[PDB]
Amino acid sequence: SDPSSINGGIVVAMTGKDCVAIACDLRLGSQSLGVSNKFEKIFHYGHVFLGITGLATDVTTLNEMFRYKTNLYKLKEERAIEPETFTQLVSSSLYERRFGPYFVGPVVAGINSKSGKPFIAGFDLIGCIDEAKDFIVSGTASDQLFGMCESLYEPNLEPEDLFETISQALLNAADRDALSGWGAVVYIIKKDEVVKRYLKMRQD
Amino acid sequence: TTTLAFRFQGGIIVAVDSRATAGNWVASQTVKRVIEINPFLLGTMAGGAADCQFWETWLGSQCRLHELREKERISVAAASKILSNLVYQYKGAGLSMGTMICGYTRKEGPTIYYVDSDGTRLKGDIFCVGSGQTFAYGVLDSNYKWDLSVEDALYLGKRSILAAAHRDAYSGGSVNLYHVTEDGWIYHGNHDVGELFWKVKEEEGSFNNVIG
Amino acid sequence: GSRRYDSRTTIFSPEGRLYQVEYALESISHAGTAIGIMASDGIVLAAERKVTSTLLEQDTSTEKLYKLNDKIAVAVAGLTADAEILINTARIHAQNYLKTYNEDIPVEILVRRLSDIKQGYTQHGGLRPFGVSFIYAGYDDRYGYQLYTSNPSGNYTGWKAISVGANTSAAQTLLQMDYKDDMKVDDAIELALKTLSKTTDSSALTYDRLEFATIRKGANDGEVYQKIFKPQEIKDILVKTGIT
Amino acid sequence: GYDRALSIFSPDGHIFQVEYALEAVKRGTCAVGVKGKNCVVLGCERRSTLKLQDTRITPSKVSKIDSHVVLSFSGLNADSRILIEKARVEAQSHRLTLEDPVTVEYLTRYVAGVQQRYTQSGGVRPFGVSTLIAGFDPRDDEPKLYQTEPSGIYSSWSAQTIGRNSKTVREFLEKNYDRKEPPATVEECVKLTVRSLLEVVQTGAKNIEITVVKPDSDIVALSSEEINQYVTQIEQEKQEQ
Amino acid sequence: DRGVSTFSPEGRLFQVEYSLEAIKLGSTAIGIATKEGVVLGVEKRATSPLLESDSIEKIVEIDRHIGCAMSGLTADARSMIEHARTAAVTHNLYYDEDINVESLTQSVCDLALRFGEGASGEERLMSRPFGVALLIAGHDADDGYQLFHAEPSGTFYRYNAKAIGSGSEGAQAELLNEWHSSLTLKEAELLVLKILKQVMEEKLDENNAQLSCITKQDGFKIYDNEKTAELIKELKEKEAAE
Amino acid sequence: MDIILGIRVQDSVILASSKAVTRGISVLKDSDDKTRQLSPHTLMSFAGEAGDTVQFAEYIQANIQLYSIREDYELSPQAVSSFVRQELAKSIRSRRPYQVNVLIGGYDKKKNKPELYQIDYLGTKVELPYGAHGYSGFYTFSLLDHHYRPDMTTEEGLDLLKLCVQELEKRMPMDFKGVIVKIVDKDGIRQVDDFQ
Amino acid sequence: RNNYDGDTVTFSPTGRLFQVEYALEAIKQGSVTVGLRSNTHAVLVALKRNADELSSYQKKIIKCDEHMGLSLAGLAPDARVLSNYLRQQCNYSSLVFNRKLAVERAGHLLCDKAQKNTQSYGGRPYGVGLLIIGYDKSGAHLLEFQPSGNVTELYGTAIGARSQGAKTYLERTLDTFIKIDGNPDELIKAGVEAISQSLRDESLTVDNLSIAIVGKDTPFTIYDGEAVAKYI
Amino acid sequence: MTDRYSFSLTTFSPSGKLGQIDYALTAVKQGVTSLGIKATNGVVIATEKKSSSPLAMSETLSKVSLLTPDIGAVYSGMGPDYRVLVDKSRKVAHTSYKRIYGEYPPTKLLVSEVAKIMQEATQSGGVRPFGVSLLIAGHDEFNGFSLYQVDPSGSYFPWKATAIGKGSVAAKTFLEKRWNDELELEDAIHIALLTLKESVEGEFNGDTIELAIIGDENPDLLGYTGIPTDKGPRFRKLTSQEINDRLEA
Numbered sequence A: 001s002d003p004s005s006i007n008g009g010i011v012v013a014m015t016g017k018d019c020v021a022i023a024c025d026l027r028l029g030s031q032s033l034g035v036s037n038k039f040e041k042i043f044h045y046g047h048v049f050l051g052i053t054g055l056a057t058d059v060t061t062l063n064e065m066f067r068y069k070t071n072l073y074k075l076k077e078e079r080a081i082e083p084e085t086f087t088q089l090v091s092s093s094l095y096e097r098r099f100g101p102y103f104v105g106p107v108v109a110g111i112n113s114k115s116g117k118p119f120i121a122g123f124d125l126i127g128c129i130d131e132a133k134d135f136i137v138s139g140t141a142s143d144q145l146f147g148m149c150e151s152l153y154e155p156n157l158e159p160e161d162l163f164e165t166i167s168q169a170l171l172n173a174a175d176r177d178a179l180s181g182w183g184a185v186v187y188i189i190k191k192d193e194v195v196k197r198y199l200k201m202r203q204d
Numbered sequence B: 001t002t003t004l005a006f007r008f009q010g011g012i013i014v015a016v017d018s019r020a021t022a023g024n025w026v027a028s029q030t031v032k033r034v035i036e037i038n039p040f041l042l043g044t045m046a047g048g049a050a051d052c053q054f055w056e057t058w059l060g061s062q063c064r065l066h067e068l069r070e071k072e073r074i075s076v077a078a079a080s081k082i083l084s085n086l087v088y089q090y091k092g093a094g095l096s097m098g099t100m101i102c103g104y105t106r107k108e109g110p111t112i113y114y115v116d117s118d119g120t121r122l123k124g125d126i127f128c129v130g131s132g133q134t135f136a137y138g139v140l141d142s143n144y145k146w147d148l149s150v151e152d153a154l155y156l157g158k159r160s161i162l163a164a165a166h167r168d169a170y171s172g173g174s175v176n177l178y179h180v181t182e183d184g185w186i187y188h189g190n191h192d193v194g195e196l197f198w199k200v201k202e203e204e205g206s207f208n209n210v211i212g
Numbered sequence C: 001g002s003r004r005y006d007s008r009t010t011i012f013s014p015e016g017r018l019y020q021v022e023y024a025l026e027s028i029s030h031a032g033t034a035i036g037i038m039a040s041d042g043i044v045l046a047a048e049r050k051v052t053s054t055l056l057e058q059d060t061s062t063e064k065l066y067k068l069n070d071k072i073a074v075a076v077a078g079l080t081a082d083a084e085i086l087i088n089t090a091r092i093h094a095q096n097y098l099k100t101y102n103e104d105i106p107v108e109i110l111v112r113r114l115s116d117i118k119q120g121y122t123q124h125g126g127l128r129p130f131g132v133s134f135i136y137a138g139y140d141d142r143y144g145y146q147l148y149t150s151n152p153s154g155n156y157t158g159w160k161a162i163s164v165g166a167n168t169s170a171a172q173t174l175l176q177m178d179y180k181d182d183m184k185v186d187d188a189i190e191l192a193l194k195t196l197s198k199t200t201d202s203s204a205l206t207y208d209r210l211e212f213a214t215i216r217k218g219a220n221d222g223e224v225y226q227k228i229f230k231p232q233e234i235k236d237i238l239v240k241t242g243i244t
Numbered sequence D: 001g002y003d004r005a006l007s008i009f010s011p012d013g014h015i016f017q018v019e020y021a022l023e024a025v026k027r028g029t030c031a032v033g034v035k036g037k038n039c040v041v042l043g044c045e046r047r048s049t050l051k052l053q054d055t056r057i058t059p060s061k062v063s064k065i066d067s068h069v070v071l072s073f074s075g076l077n078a079d080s081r082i083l084i085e086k087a088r089v090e091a092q093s094h095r096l097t098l099e100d101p102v103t104v105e106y107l108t109r110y111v112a113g114v115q116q117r118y119t120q121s122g123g124v125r126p127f128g129v130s131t132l133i134a135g136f137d138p139r140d141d142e143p144k145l146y147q148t149e150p151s152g153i154y155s156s157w158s159a160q161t162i163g164r165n166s167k168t169v170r171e172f173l174e175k176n177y178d179r180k181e182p183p184a185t186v187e188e189c190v191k192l193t194v195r196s197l198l199e200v201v202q203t204g205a206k207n208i209e210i211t212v213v214k215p216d217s218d219i220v221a222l223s224s225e226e227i228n229q230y231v232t233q234i235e236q237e238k239q240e241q
Numbered sequence E: 001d002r003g004v005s006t007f008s009p010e011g012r013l014f015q016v017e018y019s020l021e022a023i024k025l026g027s028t029a030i031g032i033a034t035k036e037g038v039v040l041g042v043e044k045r046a047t048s049p050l051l052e053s054d055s056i057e058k059i060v061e062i063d064r065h066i067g068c069a070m071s072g073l074t075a076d077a078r079s080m081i082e083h084a085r086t087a088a089v090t091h092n093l094y095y096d097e098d099i100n101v102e103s104l105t106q107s108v109c110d111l112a113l114r115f116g117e118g119a120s121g122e123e124r125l126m127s128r129p130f131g132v133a134l135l136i137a138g139h140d141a142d143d144g145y146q147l148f149h150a151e152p153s154g155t156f157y158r159y160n161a162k163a164i165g166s167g168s169e170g171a172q173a174e175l176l177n178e179w180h181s182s183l184t185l186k187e188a189e190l191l192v193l194k195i196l197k198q199v200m201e202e203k204l205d206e207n208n209a210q211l212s213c214i215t216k217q218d219g220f221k222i223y224d225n226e227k228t229a230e231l232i233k234e235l236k237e238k239e240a241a242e
Numbered sequence F: 001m002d003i004i005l006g007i008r009v010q011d012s013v014i015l016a017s018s019k020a021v022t023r024g025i026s027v028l029k030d031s032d033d034k035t036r037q038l039s040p041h042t043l044m045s046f047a048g049e050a051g052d053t054v055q056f057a058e059y060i061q062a063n064i065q066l067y068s069i070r071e072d073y074e075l076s077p078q079a080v081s082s083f084v085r086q087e088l089a090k091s092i093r094s095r096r097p098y099q100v101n102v103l104i105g106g107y108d109k110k111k112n113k114p115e116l117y118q119i120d121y122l123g124t125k126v127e128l129p130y131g132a133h134g135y136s137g138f139y140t141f142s143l144l145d146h147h148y149r150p151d152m153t154t155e156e157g158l159d160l161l162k163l164c165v166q167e168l169e170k171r172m173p174m175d176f177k178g179v180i181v182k183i184v185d186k187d188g189i190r191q192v193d194d195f196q
Numbered sequence G: 001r002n003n004y005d006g007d008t009v010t011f012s013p014t015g016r017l018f019q020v021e022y023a024l025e026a027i028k029q030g031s032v033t034v035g036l037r038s039n040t041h042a043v044l045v046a047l048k049r050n051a052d053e054l055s056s057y058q059k060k061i062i063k064c065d066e067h068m069g070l071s072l073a074g075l076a077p078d079a080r081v082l083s084n085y086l087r088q089q090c091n092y093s094s095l096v097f098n099r100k101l102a103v104e105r106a107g108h109l110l111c112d113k114a115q116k117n118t119q120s121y122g123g124r125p126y127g128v129g130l131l132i133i134g135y136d137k138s139g140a141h142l143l144e145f146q147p148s149g150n151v152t153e154l155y156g157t158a159i160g161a162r163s164q165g166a167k168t169y170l171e172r173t174l175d176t177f178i179k180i181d182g183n184p185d186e187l188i189k190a191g192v193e194a195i196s197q198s199l200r201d202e203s204l205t206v207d208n209l210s211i212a213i214v215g216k217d218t219p220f221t222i223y224d225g226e227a228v229a230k231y232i
Numbered sequence H: 001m002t003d004r005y006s007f008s009l010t011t012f013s014p015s016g017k018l019g020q021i022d023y024a025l026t027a028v029k030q031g032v033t034s035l036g037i038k039a040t041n042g043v044v045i046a047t048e049k050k051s052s053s054p055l056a057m058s059e060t061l062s063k064v065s066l067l068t069p070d071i072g073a074v075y076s077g078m079g080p081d082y083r084v085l086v087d088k089s090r091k092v093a094h095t096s097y098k099r100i101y102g103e104y105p106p107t108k109l110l111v112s113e114v115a116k117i118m119q120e121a122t123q124s125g126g127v128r129p130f131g132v133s134l135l136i137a138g139h140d141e142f143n144g145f146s147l148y149q150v151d152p153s154g155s156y157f158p159w160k161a162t163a164i165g166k167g168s169v170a171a172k173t174f175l176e177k178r179w180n181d182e183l184e185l186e187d188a189i190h191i192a193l194l195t196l197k198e199s200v201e202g203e204f205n206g207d208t209i210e211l212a213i214i215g216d217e218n219p220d221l222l223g224y225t226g227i228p229t230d231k232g233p234r235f236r237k238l239t240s241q242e243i244n245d246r247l248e249a
């Protein structure tokens, strides 16, 4: 009856020095029942990353839709979309549904291929943009995530330091959340390369 | 009310009561709960009196237009799916219908579809529908043979309705009987539950806990 | 009344042909020449830019070669603007297919949709047809490499090698002479350039009057690459054949 | 909202846009079908305008509508596609609502109706197409063949042809089809089809296409070789004279 | 040029008038109305001997008590027949009775003249008049057996006998002689056969003309070839006599 | 609640569907087949709101059958299931949502792989070794989590199912009148002639 | 030769509308019908024309309400449309106001109905002439309707083929038919006599004769067949 | 009301020409000359401010229009058709770009969009083609500086330098032999000033000549300060005092 909490799931994103990280649990539940341990919530369109927590059907719908739109963007503009611009595309697409919105909480992460500057941003379900240079959290364990990040976070962490932080923050928060868990994924992103590690976590 | 249909070696027996109540008030003991769609197709009336009587008459119109265009008898499958599909367009609007669409074609044999206002459509061999249904099922279930005679099949359907007319406050009045053959259907009369009860009691020895 | 000013763009001639389609095909016959050749390991698209000054921009310009997918390109002969309306439409259809099925649109289905649209303009709505012919280059996993042609009538066909626009009789005859099934992409590239070299309504074929694209399999088996050639590339390959 | 009356009467009582649509048919590649005692064959003619044509990806002239009924045409190509889509959809819808596949006649009558409507509607021109529709009824062994014209008229045919030089082939046909002895085998029927087609198309066993419909959704299109053997066999039976 | 619904200087609708031309180009159909019933015959007129003669349908059933004969562009008559069938059935749905032959015919005719390019009122959606005409035969309890001619002018007339199509005047003149108020039904049959044989291009036989009748008793029946063939023979002998 | 179970083994997909149909107080039918064949190699089982289930199923069947004739190609199981997933996600925001749950079972003749897809009435799709709609998971998932092996034969998978149905038959209040079992492999679709 | 008659939307340089004028001509081709009135009654008499001696005679009298009806000369389906639209406004009057519609009022409705079809492109004018009789709150009434949208109230008139014979008769016997109050059988004979001035050359049978009467003691009633033998 | 022209007014002739487009093109040729030049660090577009009566007002005659703070346009041909086209252009830059991506369209994209509007007028029922050609000069961040020409057909092409209207053929020839790929903005302005001279029949000063640059960011023209990430418009229309000032060359 609270659409944002039927399926569960979390996503967190952080910035470090010339890098960003984005992570999600792998759970898809139907309320108390765990259904899948492989429901990844992080997507990419070029070098821009999108995490989506909230109602699973809308997560899937939204991902297919930004695929479709970012493809068209490429065919016309002849380049890949950049995180700043894509954030705006996300915001305005969500607002198009202001009176019957998708029940999701997007998070954007990526490096600007021209400026090299690291970028993250978060939204509510109707598109308001939260741009911050530290961290963005979304999901059923968002308060947990907020508590963890606010304590664990330093600025300018090197990628492999940043990996430790973001992982510990996600992991420890999902563990205080009945609706998150069942696996985790972490993306470490630099303008050069992108690494994706699956995490070992409790399965209960 | 109580309506039943079942198929057997000799076609389809259709049996219904004839009572209409509004509240505790018995408004009629004389309602025709069998709708004669056309000489080959019967429908039964349960749920909304108007909804069944109306759309099943309309069904009869669509069945004729089919026979003119395609120059052949409509299949009980097709007839029933017309009714069903229509009803499904109205889902949620408050139509109330529970009904057996019954017919005998060469392609299909004796065929019964149950069709209701929820959009349900089911092929089956025995159906009962209405407040009295649970009584009629009991009699039917323990006496149904595929190889029932026609005389005997007509009896069983009649006795199953009597069963439900006795116990159910909302069923009664009289029993209307039909036999559906491939040549079409034959009406087998209207029997008042009043008289029939006593005759059945006396001749069959049943209903022992009733003073007569 | 207004009935007078109505050209009646969708009627049959007494010989059962469509005026505007016939006339549109005529229009296309004056447009830059474009060629599609299918090798065993790719497709080649080559086309002659109809107009050039020395002040025209080479790299910043498109008028002949467009991406539809990451798997399908078209070569255009005719009214550029009429082609972009039709191109954008095709681009959207392909995404619709991808969103629905989570599979890339098979080349033919895209081609049929687009021909169906042209077809409509010749049967209702009292509008002029599009003054465009399309050569389609693409890969799907049902038929592999494919080459298609479509014109203002809404008709499409599949080809091993084909040309559209100006001097197609010359070009068709030339390709028909030198085309072989076992051809490789490097061969088809050269055959294309050389066919353009002998059909040009102009003195010598330079890089800055040419557009070029190739659809390959590349290094990684499974993926297909779309290479739309830079001016300097076209120039360099012009040197490596018996030109320039 | 273009609704100009394009299909109208002229003083002799002719509808010239429907008649000019017939002209478009005569131009198209010839098509033929003949009824076996227990099959129907569709023969068509391959366009010989140009080669370098990719054979595996060019639209064939015969289309399956349902799994038991085929349609072949003659005339405008782009036009025929529209007609084919409409019928394929009606084939499905008919099954969805009546729980039976379409009879061959029903589907013919459907397509016919579509064409007729285009002869009587503001803003549209009739179809430059004529069709042969063949197959078997569901649960029936008797073969069906129907032809359709741009005016929306349809009828049944023991055998029939349409398009370029159809007038010639029709003549051959009426002087070669004994209604009292139809080609009582697949071979006898496929043979008679090539005999008719071949005497207008000229030697090209690559210029001919064949499709065979048998009862219960047995529908098979033959390779040139099967056809080439059929070509070769009557060159000989003729060169025995 | 000019409108699809314009008047000639003689006050006639061009398109309507030109449609009557297409009709005279059509296969012949004749109706005769007796008191034992109504008979309808048509000339099938097959294009090629390869054409299946059965598949030619120029006499169709509208309701059980109403039959139809057509002449002209017969593709045009499909939708008119559909509307007529829908009308007779709808009327029965609403009133639990058979529609009057007159009223059914009046309903078909309404369907004509519904053509044009934006005639300000509602919707005259149809590019051109129908190029076909109908003999509508029927019975009802108010007006007995009846025959109607329905033109594309939306006008309809009740005849005691009427022919339309190729050689109507020929046929009509012959009807004007042979028709009297006390014709039997079996007479009217032979009569239709006679007059068809005169005006048909081909020679008369069960394979190229088809006969039907509507009787109060049995409603609307189309005769089979064997049934019709026998009436051909009946006439051949009748006609070899002074 | 209606039983909708599926498991994909080594080279085949098994679907188990409850046979009961209950309208209020009576069990109107015990011989119900809650599946439609979409392709020769794709089966869809469904459970949910009374009218919606078959209407949806037949609608989807028509669309897959139309695609098949238009292309002379049998759409892949993943594609068929993306189509269905989009059709439910459209309806969830329409005026009266189809309340239907489905499993899709198909053999991908191109990849030679069995695949199983679970989708609910609101468009949530997921691909699974085994799946169930409604309460069916609650009883059987502890069984499958235990015994399931990716390399099972069809025989083993049929045994695992037999266990599941037994657990259901003993702990579930409702009598679902048993199940119909169907297998989708490379040779197409067959129904186990006798199960339980 | 002249370029101003392809539609109804075009004025000639004289100021004429040929399409309307052509429709006018359709009427004159249509068989004659006569209307006249006293103070207690109003009669329509119409000569229905057949096609064959095998055919029937086209009904030329249409009933619009219980106090009103009309005769048609011209293109018939247009009298259907027009009369049916009159049945509607007559009905509306009675349903909404419990008021029998004024015969004048129906006249204005017809005019505005017909006018619309003479100013708008794609339309055609009505090709029918109508005479309307009725008894309302101001006595008996006769109206002449032309497809140009011209309607006039008159003691008597005629429209159609050789209409001018009857019309001339009426012009002279006017002092005499208006003074025949309370005697309808004779107002019919006077109507039948006027219609005999337009026969060239046929006798009025029972099959072609059609009288309609409406008045102070009589609802609009249509006499046909045997019922008219009395006036032959 | 009752727009009954739903049929196309531009058809194909049997020769294969689209008459109305040729005629529109013709109306452009007879229009006043305007030109554009792309330098390394800027673009200039220029035209003649041909006053009808000297009672008319010079400023009131704008032929050079800001579309986007980084995009300008100028034309030759029917001026009202242009004014209209400018307003559709500005609106579309917001409606299909700013309100979706939160930034102004890149110059080629805005161009293809004006091209779209023009194409439709060569095909939609009841309309004639526009009787103008535009030169459009802009700078976005990924394509840098660019200059396009858009015609009544809907076709467009990028130019190093071009001209349209009356004196186009002379101007294009003169431009061809003065253009190198190493001009500063300032040089290309001077060249534009030269090329205009030939085409301008009469008086040739800062009040009869219109000039724009697409150049550096003018944070003086922003109107606000405080967001360093937001610099001024790159578009600048030169003042008559500015033109006259360097007319001494």
Ligand SMILES: COc1cc(/C=C/CCCN2CCCN(CCC/C=C/c3cc(OC)c(OC)c(OC)c3)CC2)cc(OC)c1OC
Residues within 6 Å of the ligand: B001, B002, B019, B020, B021, B046, B047, B048, B092, B096, B097, B098, B116, B117, B118, B129, B130, B131, B132, B170, F023, F049, F052, F099
């Ligand atoms: C025999 O005659 C009688 C019948 C009856 C009862 C009639 C039974 C007919 C059978 N059915 C018709 C009645 C209704 N029915 C099912 C109920 C429908 C639920 C509607 C609905 C509402 C929703 O809420 C929005 C839904 O969305 C969640 C939804 O799913 C899509 C469905 C079951 C089947 C009662 C009687 O006693 C007074 C009686 O004797 C006179």
